[model samples]
Target: MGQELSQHERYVEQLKQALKTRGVKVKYADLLKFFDFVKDTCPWFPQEGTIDIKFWRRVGDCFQDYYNTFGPEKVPVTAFSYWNLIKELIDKKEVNPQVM
Candidate 1:
């Protein structure tokens, strides 16, 4: 086993883990929703079509610092207030891929 996971791969794994914890399934529609929502609502969210390695590393560090400081049991609700609503809409199938 000489293979190693890249930072982006690890980040994807963490996202998958979070989805699993929430009983969420990854649909292409859902992915489109995330992409569209972030691009539309959060103009600052990175949409470079590839992992900005430096940006992601900083994000990873932030997560680590947050977890270490606050404990895993307590996590940030979100960076943007609208995220929860959007996620709920996605979960309820209220949003469509075509809408994105």
Candidate 2:
């Protein structure tokens, strides 16, 4: 518990600092257990997860929202439209896996 608590405490401080700059508030104590799990599992999979696959879908949606907020300063003005390509791959299992 000591090692886990130490790592979580550090992540709590880091998250607190980062989110504070964005005007979003979070509590370390509330997320300490999650931080501990992440720190322990990271060496194996390097990503966190939820008890359900729905959580992953929701996370994907959140990332899409973040992507849509981008402007010319982020993606180049002339970037190719690959959204359709990505959609087809994700939406269709019939796509040739080898091509990807």
Candidate 3:
């Protein structure tokens, strides 16, 4: 039988679909950066345990805001550079709600 996906796995799949629906195309390596950013930034997130559904929803909101603000025309070509920019944004500790 095929393995059933965990909540986290299902959450990631849904995230990918949302990104696709928004026409956001992140490479696999950069996609890992998205996961890492959520890990590092979200204080409520657990380090080594199952992620809660609400946490994934928050992460989705973060990504949606991010990609909406900086679409393909503006994002850097390389993943690291893109990640660095995202890191800077997070460090700023503010979200411009107008983007949504």
Candidate 4:
């Protein structure tokens, strides 16, 4: 089959929506939180963009472990997650939310 939407594509769009809803005042650090949230929470779609129920459940479990350390207003970022998170914020601002 031909290549489909990237593994990170859904995540990027979600962040775009979050940025629009939350506004430009969101901090770089808080943006990290949003990226980390998307990274950890991405659904495990199986064949043809569908989810494997067990895999989806495990993703949730991983997220639970990650989220347990933070309050509702905070997000936890692993080192790798942090790098891509910032990279994505920069990309999305350039393309989607369009920084003023």
Candidate 5:
């Protein structure tokens, strides 16, 4: 139980720190909109050879958009809750990758 919660909280915390390093905060999110955002952005796919830096930058972009919409007050205490929520979608979403 302890370990599960520990690992569970780790992602948001890690993402929070990384975004902070990038001069950003996790964005506000409602799962309703986040669902659309996930489908629209398809953030699960990163172009080949891209680095974590760019990916985090992309996350930062999405966070800003979320903040603009949901604002600081409305978001999760750690807005990375949105990030974690979206990750749940990504982890389960099918990869229909057809190598071109």
Candidate 6:
């Protein structure tokens, strides 16, 4: 495959960038892919075998920001669901100070 990216991988980087700066309107499928990649399949999963607070935090913040931008009348159910899952992980950290 040389140096070219597959189609989904292209979306991965764009969606990742969108999360970084609070860009809006993520599709449900994109949300799923990004969630999967971050959770247990991330590039750092092997070496780090751990998660950084920043990653989950950005997901939450980005979703809520999108919620606000898209207005409260409707909910981004899947996005909120992932954020809830991330929050659950945060609380169940069993310890704090970052790494988990």
Best by lDDT: 6
On a 0 to 100 scale, what is the lDDT of residue 90 in model 5?
A: 49
Compared with the true structure, what per-residue lDDT tens digits does model 5 show for residues 1-100? Answer: 1234366455656666776797753332322233344444444432221112224456566667777897864333354654556455645764332221
Candidate 4, residues 1-100, lDDT tens digits: the string is 1335476755655765775685523333343344344544434211122222223333445456657766332334443354354455455554322244
Q: Write the per-residue lDDT of candidate 1 for residues 1-100, one digit (tens) a residue.
A: 1337678546766786786687744443333333443454336543323222223333445545766797653334443343444445446654333234
Residue lDDT tens for model 3, 4-97 = 6689767777787887798654433344444655554444222332232223444556655666797533222343344455446555665332
Q: Rate the local accuracy (lDDT) of all candidates.
A: 0.44, 0.41, 0.48, 0.42, 0.46, 0.50
**Lowest lDDT 10-residue stretch of candidate 5:** 45-54
TM-score of 4: 0.25
Worst 10 residues of 1 by lDDT: 46-55
Candidates in descending lDDT order: 6, 3, 5, 1, 4, 2
In each prediction, how many residue pairs overlap at the backbone (N, C-alpha, C within less than 3 A)? 0, 0, 0, 1, 0, 0
Best model per TM-score: 6
Q: Tell me how far the alpha carbon of residue 24 in candidate 2 is from the true structure, in angstroms, after superposition.
A: 1.6
- Which segments of model 5 are wrong by more than 4 Å? 1-57, 62-71, 74-78, 96-100
Query: How well is each residue in 1-100 modelled by candidate 6, as lDDT tens digits?
Result: 2346779767876766766587543334444444554444323332122334445555567556757897543335654554556556656775444343
TM-score of 3: 0.32
Alpha carbon lDDT at 9, candidate 4 = 52
lDDT of 2 at 36: 34
CA lDDT of 3 in candidate 3? Answer: 44
Candidate 3 lDDT: 0.48
